[PDB]
Amino acid sequence: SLSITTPEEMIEKAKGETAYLPCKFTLSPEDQGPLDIEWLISPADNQKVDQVIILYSGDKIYDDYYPDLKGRVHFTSNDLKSGDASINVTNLQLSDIGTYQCKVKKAPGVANKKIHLVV
Amino acid sequence: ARSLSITTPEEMIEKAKGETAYLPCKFTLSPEDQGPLDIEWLISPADNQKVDQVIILYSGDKIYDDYYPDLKGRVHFTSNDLKSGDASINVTNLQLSDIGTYQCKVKKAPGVANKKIHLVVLV
Amino acid sequence: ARSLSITTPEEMIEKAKGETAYLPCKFTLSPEDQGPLDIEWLISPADNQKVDQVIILYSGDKIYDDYYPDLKGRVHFTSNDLKSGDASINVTNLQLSDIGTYQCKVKKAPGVANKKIHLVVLV
Amino acid sequence: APITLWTGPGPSINGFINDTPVIRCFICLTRDSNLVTVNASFVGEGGYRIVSPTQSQFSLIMEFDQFGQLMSTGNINSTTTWGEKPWGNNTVQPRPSHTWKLCMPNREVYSTPAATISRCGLDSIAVDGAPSRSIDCMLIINKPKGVATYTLTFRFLNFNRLSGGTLFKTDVLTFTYVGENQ
Amino acid sequence: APITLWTGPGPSINGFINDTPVIRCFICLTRDSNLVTVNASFVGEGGYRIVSPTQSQFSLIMEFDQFGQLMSTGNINSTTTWGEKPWGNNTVQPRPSHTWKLCMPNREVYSTPAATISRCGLDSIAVDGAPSRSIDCMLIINKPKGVATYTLTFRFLNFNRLSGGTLFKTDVLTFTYVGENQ
Amino acid sequence: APITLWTGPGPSINGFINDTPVIRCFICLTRDSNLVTVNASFVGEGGYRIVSPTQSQFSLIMEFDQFGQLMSTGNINSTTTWGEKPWGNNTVQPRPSHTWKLCMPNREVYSTPAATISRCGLDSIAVDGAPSRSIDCMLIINKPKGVATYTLTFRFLNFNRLSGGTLFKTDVLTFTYVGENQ
């Protein structure tokens, strides 16, 4: 079945560095739906939770969602459909502190990974 | 008993003003009646258009009786051990406004039974 | 017949202005058609965006013919015995506004058939 | 088992107002395990094609006997196409079945009349759901009428909510009630 | 298989406000293949028989455990007549079944609370669906409460819509949610 | 038999406005014996997280082929998780089946476009059902769109009903239409 490698982590980083948030996944033969990936942020700063930061669907990337991370989030892989939904959060700030969730779907497959990012 | 039932489904009772009416509602439970005991009494008064107005309730082994303003402090369950088959009430200090049909509904699921009593208060 | 059917389910008819147009709708019922006979004619005029507008109907052994103001007094069922298989109508004193697609719908549940007639009117 | 009674698709003009059928009613009564869903839409015809804000309210009553068969006495009645929908096709089967009773409003649950008043959009696609292009439709369940055992009333109300003349082309309306026991 | 949990017809006074049962609720939860239809109607009793535009808003919460069984702790609770409706009769069967869970709101789909706020006509037949005789009823699905696994809340709102004193006799209300998996 | 097609629980951002996926749509189409219930809720994201009274109206169109398969051409389309819900679990099974057609709007019943405009409460729990926190959502059934055989459009309307900026967190919306025949 559909799985992510290391379904929970903590990454310690310093301000102005770029955090490599890994999300490597394995596909099952039954996973026949469209690959459907999203990363979310639960910021420690405020009340809102589970806020999209970047998206991959229809073999296209969409990233204009979270104003704070504008121009600072991107998928690292040139071949994301092969099993790598990892992202970079460049030029880390104090306000980036929070839980980052990677959700991979490829129906019936569903997996997610939470990373607690500390800056 | 074969099913939930009340004794004497229908009755007419006449009493003088200022007296207390004893309104019987005794019931028999069946083995299948495994639900919670859920009793209410209702008045449909001759006075006004309204019908099936709660006067007193028994549920969760508790009595509730602050429903019908004209009967305030004048309706009580007569039995101490109501759950052993006696949902009878008295209505004390009878007034002409008490004239109406009184209905005793007894539920203990899947059992249901009811009965009506036509009360008349005489000057 | 095997099912509810109309003879010649699409026609193209050309008439002169002032003429009377005979729009045929002959139908055969099947033995399974056990519901009430339920017939209507609709018009989709070329004049305007209005579509499937009822002009005449047969239901409950009665004719209703006051739906389409332009055809007041100008449309009628021709047959003396309509239930027997003849839903045809006359459209009298033809106008150029009468140009359109006329549809005969016959239902006798579970039977349903329809027929389209394209009426042109020339000066 | 489930059972559907309906007008069929392409309904006839089957809603009588003052002894002329003038409303084209699509009505579907679908009984699943316990509840009946009423799925209905209406199109005014002739003088009822466009309704004005001054339009008087009216009831279209369906009257059913104790076996769930439409009687000839209501505003929507047995003189038009009405019957069962088979699973798998769009036919209207007039041959009664004992199962038709299951489409009826439970007589013990609805021993006094029940109602649901809902918003009823008119010409909603063309007016793009403009708020003052809605009326109300009230379903009345088992309001007594003649010698019917069961009744369903579609009552069209509050036309004075309309801002002006509006095509009487209703939204698809849904209602629910507890179905009768076999 | 489908499953209906309900209060039965002629429901008891079973909706507690401030530790007194004052609202008579007919509630039916019917699970067909996937969705649960909530079919419900309410009559206020005693001091709640007639509500005014200044009636404060209130919630009647049903609390269920992990097996779809009504708990003792809600405003509508296990001291009232509640249980399964057999196909074919109007009894209320209190003997629990594993299938009762199928009436519960899917804990994965409603892992955060969902809501539907709907119109709630009062005394609709009598007042002929007059616009200003409606309040609102909001169904809240899985608002957390205590050790309950599932909750259904009927929250009565916006009494200030009322033109004046109105009999608290609601329309039949319908809501839908995705049922729990066995 | 019945069949449910859905997005799954915890749906992705799958509703495109102006070539960008911005609305997170929970959508369940549950076909029982005859009717299909649409059960749906929406959460605006990014620029659509909060909507204001001046928000322009928009449609989320689902396009389906003749076999009831979601096409790639709609605002909600086959690039997102979508497929059959098995009885007993919350998986989304993407493998087509002939039974998928059964969730489609009967093309003979809906041979011209049909609609239901309903209230759509926003953030209803948090704003406690404030009357000025509702918009409208209209389901349009089979409004033609390119090569699609079936369409379902969720059209969000009358944002100017809002008193102010509201979280675009919709109620659970329910609609019903007659299902296609196999």
Side-chain angles (χ1 to χ4, degrees):
Chain A
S1 51
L2 182 32
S3 68
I4 291 171
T5 310
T6 320
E8 215 201 31
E9 289 179 37
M10 244 227 60
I11 284 84
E12 282 193 11
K13 276 271 146 257
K15 188 180 158 201
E17 306 182 343
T18 71
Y20 176 59
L21 308 188
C23 184
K24 297 267 190 166
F25 64 88
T26 323
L27 286 192
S28 174
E30 67 219 46
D31 298 336
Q32 286 282 310
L35 182 61
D36 190 2
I37 301 170
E38 80 176 331
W39 280 89
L40 299 150
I41 208 288
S42 290
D45 306 74
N46 58 46
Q47 310 296 347
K48 56 184 169 79
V49 65
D50 299 325
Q51 298 290 325
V52 249
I53 70 182
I54 196 160
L55 215 76
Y56 181 87
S57 68
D59 297 337
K60 215 164 299 200
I61 302 171
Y62 306 93
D63 58 12
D64 189 69
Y65 296 109
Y66 204 68
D68 282 356
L69 288 170
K70 171 76 167 197
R72 297 199 293 116
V73 183
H74 50 266
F75 282 118
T76 53
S77 187
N78 58 358
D79 191 5
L80 182 148
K81 62 162 70 179
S82 293
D84 192 6
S86 308
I87 64 170
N88 275 333
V89 177
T90 57
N91 200 241
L92 286 157
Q93 299 300 332
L94 301 165
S95 44
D96 300 333
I97 289 176
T99 310
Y100 289 70
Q101 185 164 51
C102 181
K103 269 207 168 205
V104 184
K105 286 171 186 179
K106 202 177 184 301
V110 201
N112 61 248
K113 169 170 178 167
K114 298 175 194 270
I115 296 164
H116 317 286
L117 181 65
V118 182
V119 173
Chain B
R2 200 145 304 117
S3 61
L4 205 168
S5 60
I6 297 171
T7 326
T8 299
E10 185 155 289
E11 204 176 333
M12 184 167 78
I13 290 176
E14 291 196 308
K15 299 294 272 61
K17 170 172 170 173
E19 290 192 315
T20 85
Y22 174 67
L23 309 177
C25 183
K26 291 204 186 185
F27 58 93
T28 319
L29 299 175
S30 154
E32 88 201 334
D33 298 338
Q34 289 166 27
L37 186 61
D38 188 2
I39 310 318
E40 74 172 350
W41 279 84
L42 300 147
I43 193 191
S44 294
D47 275 351
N48 41 45
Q49 305 292 272
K50 57 185 174 189
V51 169
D52 307 336
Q53 301 296 304
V54 243
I55 66 181
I56 186 162
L57 262 176
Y58 183 87
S59 69
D61 203 38
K62 274 185 185 78
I63 300 165
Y64 301 94
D65 65 359
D66 202 36
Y67 290 114
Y68 196 80
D70 292 0
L71 282 173
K72 190 179 166 214
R74 310 200 285 100
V75 179
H76 333 86
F77 286 112
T78 56
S79 176
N80 52 27
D81 192 25
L82 184 163
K83 57 195 160 67
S84 290
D86 185 2
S88 311
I89 53 162
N90 62 202
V91 178
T92 70
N93 213 319
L94 283 168
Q95 297 170 11
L96 292 186
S97 62
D98 297 343
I99 298 173
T101 301
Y102 291 71
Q103 184 181 27
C104 180
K105 293 187 183 179
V106 173
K107 287 174 185 190
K108 200 180 193 309
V112 209
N114 81 103
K115 74 162 277 181
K116 286 169 174 177
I117 300 169
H118 319 293
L119 176 65
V120 176
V121 186
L122 304 169
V123 174
Chain C
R2 209 181 310 178
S3 66
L4 205 168
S5 68
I6 298 174
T7 315
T8 317
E10 189 167 294
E11 277 190 74
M12 286 72 73
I13 293 178
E14 270 190 53
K15 304 259 81 179
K17 212 248 287 306
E19 297 282 19
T20 294
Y22 181 66
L23 305 185
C25 192
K26 314 281 183 299
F27 63 88
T28 309
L29 304 165
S30 70
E32 77 190 297
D33 298 324
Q34 290 300 315
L37 186 65
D38 194 354
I39 300 178
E40 82 179 336
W41 283 82
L42 314 167
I43 205 286
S44 304
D47 268 33
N48 51 59
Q49 302 262 312
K50 316 207 286 83
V51 131
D52 304 336
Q53 296 297 310
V54 61
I55 60 168
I56 194 163
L57 96 66
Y58 180 81
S59 176
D61 301 298
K62 297 180 184 162
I63 297 158
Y64 302 93
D65 61 6
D66 202 29
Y67 297 107
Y68 202 69
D70 293 354
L71 288 171
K72 181 69 177 299
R74 304 204 296 112
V75 171
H76 61 272
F77 283 115
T78 48
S79 188
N80 58 24
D81 197 13
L82 191 166
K83 66 186 177 167
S84 211
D86 193 354
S88 313
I89 56 167
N90 268 350
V91 178
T92 66
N93 188 27
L94 281 165
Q95 319 285 319
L96 297 167
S97 78
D98 299 338
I99 298 175
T101 298
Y102 294 66
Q103 187 163 50
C104 179
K105 291 212 202 309
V106 180
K107 302 181 204 178
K108 191 167 208 299
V112 205
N114 90 95
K115 164 161 178 175
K116 280 182 169 157
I117 300 189
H118 311 289
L119 183 51
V120 183
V121 184
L122 317 178
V123 177
Chain D
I3 188 267
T4 290
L5 294 176
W6 80 334
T7 51
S12 323
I13 305 172
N14 48 3
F16 280 75
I17 305 170
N18 301 327
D19 303 312
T20 301
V22 293
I23 310 307
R24 197 184 291 277
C25 309
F26 172 81
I27 302 163
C28 186
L29 306 178
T30 290
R31 166 65 181 268
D32 286 289
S33 70
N34 179 59
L35 299 176
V36 182
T37 312
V38 186
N39 183 264
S41 60
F42 305 84
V43 185
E45 305 291 353
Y48 286 83
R49 195 176 63 92
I50 310 309
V51 284
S52 77
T54 66
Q55 171 62 47
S56 51
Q57 345 210 82
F58 61 89
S59 282
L60 300 177
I61 309 171
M62 313 177 75
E63 293 181 35
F64 294 94
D65 70 25
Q66 65 267 46
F67 314 110
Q69 295 181 38
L70 195 57
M71 298 162 63
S72 69
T73 51
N75 302 107
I76 307 159
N77 68 58
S78 55
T79 65
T80 42
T81 306
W82 176 259
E84 183 166 6
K85 190 189 179 297
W87 193 92
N89 65 63
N90 287 330
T91 60
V92 180
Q93 297 299 333
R95 194 211 224 181
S97 178
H98 56 86
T99 57
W100 288 16
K101 189 167 102 181
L102 299 173
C103 285
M104 295 298 104
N106 193 293
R107 68 190 181 264
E108 216 187 317
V109 173
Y110 306 108
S111 61
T112 48
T116 306
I117 186 157
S118 291
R119 181 180 177 177
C120 182
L122 297 191
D123 202 23
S124 301
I125 298 159
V127 297
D128 206 14
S132 57
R133 300 290 196 179
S134 292
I135 67 171
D136 294 316
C137 183
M138 186 165 64
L139 184 69
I140 315 170
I141 299 155
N142 276 353
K143 185 147 171 188
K145 174 83 174 180
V147 293
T149 299
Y150 305 102
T151 65
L152 294 179
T153 307
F154 299 97
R155 189 159 175 74
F156 298 88
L157 292 159
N158 305 324
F159 287 92
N160 59 359
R161 288 185 175 180
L162 300 171
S163 49
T166 311
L167 195 70
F168 193 16
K169 197 222 291 284
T170 85
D171 284 2
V172 175
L173 304 181
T174 310
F175 306 96
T176 300
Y177 59 79
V178 178
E180 189 55 283
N181 302 310
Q182 195 88 269
Chain E
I3 157 79
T4 285
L5 291 175
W6 76 337
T7 50
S12 312
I13 308 183
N14 58 5
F16 282 75
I17 306 183
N18 297 304
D19 298 43
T20 308
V22 289
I23 313 300
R24 199 188 290 285
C25 328
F26 172 82
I27 296 155
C28 181
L29 305 174
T30 292
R31 167 68 188 259
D32 289 284
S33 68
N34 179 55
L35 295 170
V36 178
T37 305
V38 183
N39 185 276
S41 60
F42 308 84
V43 186
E45 307 291 2
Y48 288 82
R49 190 170 62 85
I50 292 163
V51 297
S52 68
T54 59
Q55 174 60 51
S56 78
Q57 304 170 141
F58 65 91
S59 281
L60 301 173
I61 310 172
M62 309 188 74
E63 299 188 26
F64 303 92
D65 72 15
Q66 61 266 57
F67 312 110
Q69 302 187 26
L70 191 61
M71 292 164 58
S72 62
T73 44
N75 307 104
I76 303 152
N77 63 63
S78 52
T79 65
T80 201
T81 299
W82 180 256
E84 179 160 2
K85 185 192 179 295
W87 198 88
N89 67 49
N90 284 333
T91 66
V92 183
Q93 296 293 334
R95 206 201 215 200
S97 170
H98 58 98
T99 61
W100 286 16
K101 186 167 62 165
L102 303 176
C103 286
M104 297 300 99
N106 193 300
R107 67 202 194 265
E108 193 166 359
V109 175
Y110 307 108
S111 62
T112 51
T116 306
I117 192 159
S118 293
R119 178 181 185 170
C120 183
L122 305 184
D123 206 15
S124 295
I125 294 159
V127 305
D128 207 20
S132 55
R133 300 292 193 169
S134 288
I135 68 170
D136 286 328
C137 187
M138 187 166 62
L139 180 69
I140 317 169
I141 305 162
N142 282 357
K143 224 273 224 314
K145 181 94 172 310
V147 302
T149 307
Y150 309 96
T151 62
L152 298 183
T153 307
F154 301 92
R155 183 162 177 77
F156 299 86
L157 289 167
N158 306 323
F159 287 92
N160 50 85
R161 263 205 199 75
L162 294 175
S163 48
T166 310
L167 196 71
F168 194 9
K169 180 186 183 186
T170 80
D171 287 3
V172 176
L173 310 174
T174 306
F175 307 93
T176 306
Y177 57 80
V178 184
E180 188 61 278
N181 299 314
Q182 191 65 82
Chain F
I3 181 237
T4 291
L5 285 172
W6 77 337
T7 51
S12 5
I13 304 183
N14 51 16
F16 285 76
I17 309 177
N18 299 314
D19 301 338
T20 315
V22 291
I23 313 299
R24 194 183 291 278
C25 316
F26 179 78
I27 296 162
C28 188
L29 305 176
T30 289
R31 169 58 185 268
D32 289 289
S33 60
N34 182 48
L35 301 174
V36 180
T37 312
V38 177
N39 188 275
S41 57
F42 308 83
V43 186
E45 305 290 355
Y48 289 81
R49 199 175 58 94
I50 299 169
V51 284
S52 63
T54 59
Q55 168 65 43
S56 57
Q57 303 171 149
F58 66 88
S59 280
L60 302 178
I61 309 170
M62 299 182 90
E63 296 174 36
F64 299 95
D65 71 12
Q66 334 87 290
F67 317 108
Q69 303 176 146
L70 191 69
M71 295 162 68
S72 69
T73 46
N75 308 106
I76 303 160
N77 67 61
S78 50
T79 69
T80 350
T81 303
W82 177 258
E84 191 175 351
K85 188 192 178 297
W87 197 88
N89 73 58
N90 289 335
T91 63
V92 181
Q93 296 298 325
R95 197 219 224 186
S97 174
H98 59 84
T99 58
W100 286 21
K101 193 181 174 180
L102 299 172
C103 292
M104 296 299 99
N106 195 298
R107 69 194 193 280
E108 202 179 340
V109 179
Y110 305 111
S111 69
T112 53
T116 304
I117 183 164
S118 311
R119 181 174 181 173
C120 180
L122 297 178
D123 205 25
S124 302
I125 294 164
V127 303
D128 204 26
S132 62
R133 300 285 182 168
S134 284
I135 67 174
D136 290 326
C137 184
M138 187 173 52
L139 181 70
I140 314 174
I141 302 162
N142 288 348
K143 184 154 175 173
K145 187 76 176 314
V147 301
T149 303
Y150 309 97
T151 65
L152 300 173
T153 309
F154 300 95
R155 187 153 175 85
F156 296 84
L157 292 170
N158 307 325
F159 283 93
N160 59 13
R161 294 262 199 73
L162 297 174
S163 47
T166 310
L167 202 73
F168 196 24
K169 179 178 188 180
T170 82
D171 285 5
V172 176
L173 311 180
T174 304
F175 308 99
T176 300
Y177 56 77
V178 179
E180 188 59 279
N181 302 308
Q182 192 66 84

